[PDB]
Amino acid sequence: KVPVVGIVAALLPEMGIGFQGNLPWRLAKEMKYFREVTTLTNDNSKQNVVIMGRKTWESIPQKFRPLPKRINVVVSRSFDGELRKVEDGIYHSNSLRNCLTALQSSLANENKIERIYIIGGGEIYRQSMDLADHWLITKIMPLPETTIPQMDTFLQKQELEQRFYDNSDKLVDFLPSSIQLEGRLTSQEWNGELVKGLPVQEKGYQFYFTLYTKKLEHHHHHHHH
Ligand SMILES: NC(=O)C1=CN([C@@H]2O[C@H](COP(=O)(O)OP(=O)(O)OC[C@H]3O[C@@H](n4cnc5c(N)ncnc54)[C@H](OP(=O)(O)O)[C@@H]3O)[C@@H](O)[C@H]2O)C=CC1
Ligand SMILES: COc1cc(-c2ccccc2)cc([C@@H](C)C#Cc2c(C)nc(N)nc2N)c1
């Protein structure tokens, strides 16, 4: 019952997110959004968790890891079990799924996690479509003059739009209430797709903060004793 939220910056239309182990852009404003969203809580006595794969961990500059003021979890199949403190601010897990179950125990967590953010990378996100309750996706578009950057890692847009709908009308309300956003909400056609969310521009790019929410489910089975 703590929300699990995938958070990702992706280039349209392919939803590219990475190239040779690194982000394909450096956008200070996007990074500020990610920082504030994953750090900030509505309740001052809680922190959020950020969960990431080993390769993503290794790409964060050494001065900036672990990410401050958030519980960091790194997942590697070569680690020891399902959630182990290895250093201040650092947990290792050998299982994305079992670490989420572990993080959800109110006995372990004392109800002092607000949200669990899944912060990448590709392999991790592949596995999170059936785990996340919401996705915060920054939809990035090169302006007409901008060279499209090369990329090698992609968000699974098909599987996204299967399970989730664009709930960006509720993005403002979904974010911790102290964040301040520059744009107003905004529906724009771009290459035949509808892009809705909160606009910024930086460097060669325009980008929208968007929110995706699980679609309604039929009631097929509830488990009884
Ligand atoms: N634009 C964006 O918002 C973001 C983009 N990225 C990008 O993504 C790319 C990195 O993605 P990718 O290469 O797929 O790597 P990941 O960051 O997803 O790491 C993959 C590694 O995580 C571990 N892992 C994966 N699944 C599990 C599991 N179920 N249980 C335990 N461990 C698991 C394995 O570690 P091991 O090999 O040790 O066993 C695996 O090799 C980079 O280009 C990066 O820049 C990353 C974050 C955000
Ligand atoms: C691939 O190299 C990376 C470097 C950093 C990083 C770079 C500088 C300072 C702190 C972190 C963060 C990341 C990851 C953890 C991220 C991210 C992320 C961003 C920037 N935006 C959105 N919307 N979602 C994310 N998950 C990766």
Q: Please state, in angstroms and rounded to a whole number, the distance separating the CA atoms of residues 153 and 45.
A: 36
Residue owning the nearest CA to atom 16 of ligand 2: 119
Q: By the 8 A CB rule, do 135 and 3 touch?
A: no
CA of 153 relative to ligand 2 center, distance in Å: 14
CA of 217 relative to ligand 2 center, distance in Å: 32
With vertex at residue 66, the alpha carbon angle to CA 197 and CA 18, rounded to the nearest 5 degrees, is 50
Question: What's the reported resolution, in angstroms, to a tenth?
Answer: 2.1
Burial classification of residue 62, based on how many CB atoms lie within 10 Å of its CB (0-12 exposed, 13-18 middle, 19 or more buried):
exposed
- What is the CATH number for 206? 3.40.430.10
CB neighbours of residue 195 within 10 Å: 20
Name the DSSP class of 191: T
> Which residue of 15, 27, 34 sits with most ligand 2 atoms within 8 Å of its CB, as the best mutation to test the pocket?
34
Does 23 participate in catalysis according to the annotation? yes
Q: Please state, in angstroms and rounded to a whole number, the distance separating the CA atoms of residues 26 and 111.
A: 35
Q: Please state, in angstroms and rounded to a whole number, the distance separating the CA atoms of residues 204 and 146.
A: 5
Q: Please state, in angstroms and rounded to a whole number, the distance separating the CA atoms of residues 84 and 90.
A: 8
Six-digit token pair at 92?
């290792």
Q: Please state, in angstroms and rounded to a whole number, the distance separating the CA atoms of residues 5 and 225.
A: 31
| 137 C-beta closer than 6 A to ligand 2 | no
Q: What type of residue is 76? A: S
Q: What type of residue is 88? A: D
Atom of ligand 2 nearest to the CA of 136: 23
Atom of ligand 2 nearest to the CA of 31: 20
**CA nearest to 48, candidates 15, 17, 5, 108:** 5
Q: Say which residues have a Cβ less than 8 Å from residue 125's Cβ, sequence separation at least 6.
A: 6, 8, 17, 118, 155, 156
Name the DSSP class of 114: E
Q: Please state, in angstroms and rounded to a whole number, the distance separating the CA atoms of residues 183 and 185.
A: 7
Six-digit token pair at 220?
């097929």
| 195 C-beta closer than 6 A to ligand 1 | no
Which structural domain range is residue 172 located in?
1-225
CA of 107 relative to ligand 2 center, distance in Å: 31
| 66 C-beta closer than 6 A to ligand 1 | no
Domain count, the chain: 1
